[model samples]
Target: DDSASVEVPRRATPADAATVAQMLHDFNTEFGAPTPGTDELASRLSHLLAGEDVVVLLAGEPPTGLAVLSFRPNVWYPGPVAILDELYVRPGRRGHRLGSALLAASCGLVRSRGGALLEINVDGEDTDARRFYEARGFTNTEPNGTEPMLYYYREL
Candidate 1:
């Protein structure tokens, strides 16, 4: 799976969501994507999908990986924006350019839709991802830590 070429395709269905979630769960468990409280995380994610911001990328015949993007009004800016909510390129497929290509495609979609900004979150441990975003011109970290995204979740 670590071939030279990787194409990015968007998985736009609930079935795809299931696949994406499973892949996501596996990816998280392996490389520390954030441990979810099983039942609770599933319920919460299901609720969030009521809107159409969640996006998943299907990259192979059997689906190499799943990358999700969420769309919304750019709170910091003055127009619509897109956030790469969750992007997971299967560990085996990581070294390849799959993640970068998939992410670029996501940003392209946002730009084509007249969106103003595209953002993503990378954990400090994910040095590879941080470098990927920076290479693609997606780095806009706060200078003095003024704008930080805080997540507040509760049991549903």
Candidate 2:
């Protein structure tokens, strides 16, 4: 009974500020994540969409899901690396292949930009998330015994 079809994921634009804004709030709220100010989020999303560092893919007719990805060059890689910062599907719109489609689209984006690899951080205890990424050929470590990485952040 999961035959619902989702539209092809598209990169978000500055004009999608409102829709993207709501989804931003929805996504964070869905997982009990931190919530920033509405104005701040809207501003940040606009900047991300217009800048070269981020790619935001939205799915559904009016956009029921979104995947936020960022690209950065690291000394460890010759090409840029894509980081999947957020992936979310609205509760009522889940089970329709939205997550999978969004992720697939993200992979394409990364490859199209010649990124070395795509990375994401998932909760160690979140088996569902682990399985999802693993199913898509993402591993917890490189060929070496190196585990996933950790980055320090200082919020502004």
What's each prediction's TM-score? 0.68, 0.83
Tens-digit lDDT string for candidate 2 (30-88): 77988886678888888878887988999888788889999999898777999999888
Per-residue lDDT of model 1, residues 36-150, tens digit only: 6545545555655555666555666677755677778755766578888876675544634677677778877777767878776666676777767778886555667665454
Which candidate achieves the best lDDT against the true structure? 2
Which lDDT value does model 1 have at 58?
Answer: 65
Model 1 lDDT at residue 3: 75
Q: Cα lDDT for residue 109, model 2?
A: 88
Candidate lDDT scores, in order, read 0.66, 0.83
Candidate 1 error regions (>4 Å): 1-6, 32-50, 75-78, 92-95, 141-156
Clashes of each: 0, 0
Candidate 1 local Cα displacement, residue 92, angstroms: 6.0
Please identify model 2 stretches exceeding 4 Å from their true place. 1-6, 91-96, 146-156
Cα error, candidate 2, residue 82 (Å): 0.7
Global local distance difference test of model 2: 0.83
